[PDB]
From a paper:
The [name]-[name]-2 main or 3C-like protease ([name] or 3CLpro) is essential for viral replication and is a promising drug target. The [name] inhibitor, nirmatrelvir, is the antiviral component of Paxlovid, an orally available treatment for COVID-19. The E166 residue is known to be a potential hot spot for drug resistance and yeast assays identified substitutions which conferred strong nirmatrelvir resistance and others that compromised activity. As the E166 site appears to be a hot spot for drug resistance from in vitro viral evolution experiments, we solved the structures of two substitution mutants [name] [name] and [name] E166R, revealing how E166 mutations may compromise activity versus drug resistance, respectively.
Toward addressing both questions, we solved the crystal structure of apo [name] [name] and the complex structure of [name] E166R with GC-376 at 2.3 and 2.1 Å resolution, respectively. Both proteins were crystallized in the C2 space group with one [name] molecule per asymmetric unit, and the biological dimer can be generated through crystallographic symmetry. In the [name] [name] mutant structure, N166 forms a hydrogen bond (HB) with H163, an interaction not observed between E166 and H163 in the wild-type [name] structure. This new HB prevents H163 from hydrogen bonding with the glutamine side chain of the substrate, an interaction crucial to substrate binding. The binding of the substrate would therefore require N166 to adopt a different conformation, breaking the HB with H163 and increasing the energetic cost. These observations are consistent with the drastic decrease of activity in the [name] mutant and lack of toxicity when expressed in yeast bringing to light how residues outside of the catalytic core can influence substrate binding. In contrast, [name] and E166D displayed severe reductions in catalytic efficiencies of ~84- and ~74-fold compared to WT, respectively. Expression of [name] E166D and [name] [name] did not cause a reduction in growth and grew as well as empty vector controls. These results indicate that [name] E166D and [name] [name] may have defects in their enzymatic activities. In turn the crystal structure shows that the asparagine prevents substrate binding through a new hydrogen bond with H163, providing a mechanism to explain the significant reduction in activity.
Numbering used by the authors:
A (entry chain A), B (entry chain A): 1 to 305
Write the structure that this text describes.
Amino acid sequence: SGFRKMAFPSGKVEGCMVQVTCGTTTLNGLWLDDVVYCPRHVICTSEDMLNPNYEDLLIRKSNHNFLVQAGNVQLRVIGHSMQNCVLKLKVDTANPKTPKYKFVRIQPGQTFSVLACYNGSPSGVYQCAMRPNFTIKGSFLNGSCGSVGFNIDYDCVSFCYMHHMNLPTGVHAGTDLEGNFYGPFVDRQTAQAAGTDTTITVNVLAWLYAAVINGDRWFLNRFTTTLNDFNLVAMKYNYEPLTQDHVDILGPLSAQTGIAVLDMCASLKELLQNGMNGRTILGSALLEDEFTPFDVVRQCSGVTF
Amino acid sequence: SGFRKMAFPSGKVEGCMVQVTCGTTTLNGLWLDDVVYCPRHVICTSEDMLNPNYEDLLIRKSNHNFLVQAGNVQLRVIGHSMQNCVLKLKVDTANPKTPKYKFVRIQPGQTFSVLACYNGSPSGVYQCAMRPNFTIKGSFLNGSCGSVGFNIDYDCVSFCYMHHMNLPTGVHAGTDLEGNFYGPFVDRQTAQAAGTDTTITVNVLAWLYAAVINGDRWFLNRFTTTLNDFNLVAMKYNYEPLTQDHVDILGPLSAQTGIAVLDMCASLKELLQNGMNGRTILGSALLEDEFTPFDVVRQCSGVTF
């Protein structure tokens, strides 16, 4: 009973966090096997950060200039390479706490837990979504860079995010664990246009299902609709279009709730067109698009790790 | 930049969770040193739960009837006692992962992270507040009972909550780690009147400060007010009264934000009386009372553990 924004357990990831210092700059890093992953902007000084040539800056640097503190204990850097926008420091020790893990790139709309860190020390954990414009709405102060986002599949930790930039706009940008930015971003302190953000339609849908499951059901209407009809209204309200794929993903919830996806769409249209009239759905006055269909089923069916 | 609802890192607590089975019933338990803490309602069968005499039921039970699975591994129960509404099973092994810890009772308004569990396995983590009527608004399915809530002070884990009841109303009740229920609750499947819940005034205040810190500041007015004046309006909107103590606690934020508590109150009164007019404060259409003054300073100043 009840339904909340819920992060994964952070333990396994906690034991992979390390501090990485280079000259002045210090930030977080991820220690897996004999390799530590971190942002290359560690090697920038303030001036560089306006337009760094990352080729030239690294050439000047050598193993011994990379200080990698694993909590209390130093680690011996024995090699370094740069893969897109990430840095990869090889070290004599393999992390004994290395979990079962993968690196995945995620699609916009998919959620993950962030473990926010300063000086390689865990600070707090929260759930986020990859916004359609490839930004995230997290909580990141100076030093948060290097913090990772991840999912868990029973015992396996898919890392999907590493934080790099706090955009002038106060949202957030970063890379997959192969250094490729999510979105049109680059690692340099400049003005950077992030696009129109739209609302993640399938998630909201999935969120309404959870509500019905939890007895918030005032929003249920008799009406039905069609994809074409609804999308026409979505576009109007900056919602992503809806696809058969989305519907297919919303299938299990339909089967259990006994509410056909397209009637739910009906409910949504009404909300969009009419607002909520001072009503709340699961203690929120607006609609929540940061819950995947999967996210609901896990929470509602009580999956453990 | 940005500001979110953020739980503590769950690792240290993760390694204290164990499954506890007795007859049919199975639920979570907390293994610390050679002691495992769990709800006594484990020893109830369905029928008992309408009106269990906990004295008589335990008398019938003996050590060997308590199955305590530590993930994979069984533990040898070598003694048992009942302390108010908690059960305390002594075992030959002391948990090697036992963290530095305390047990605290918390006051209403104070927040903590819940680690929701099924079969002694971590499921997910979220932040909660002790509502003025001593309920919580979490996410708890059958088996969630035994899950604990806690805070962290650098390296020390104050446990403040263990979950027992999912109330007919769809909110939640439980004990401190000495078994004394928070609130007027008891461990029996009956209708249980939880009181009027009011809104946690100081928290909302503290929350507005974070907003201003994050550049949401449209709600800032020129007006000022007094305690007496404001409280008069609070009572009207079911807000807890405000005390010099609350103000004293809001002092640091005032000093850094340069906004005197009582002007902030001014802003709040206006919001209460006028609503938000379709505006949002930190991506919420209503006001957030589940953030302590401490909670803001940690997040905003970036404290680690």
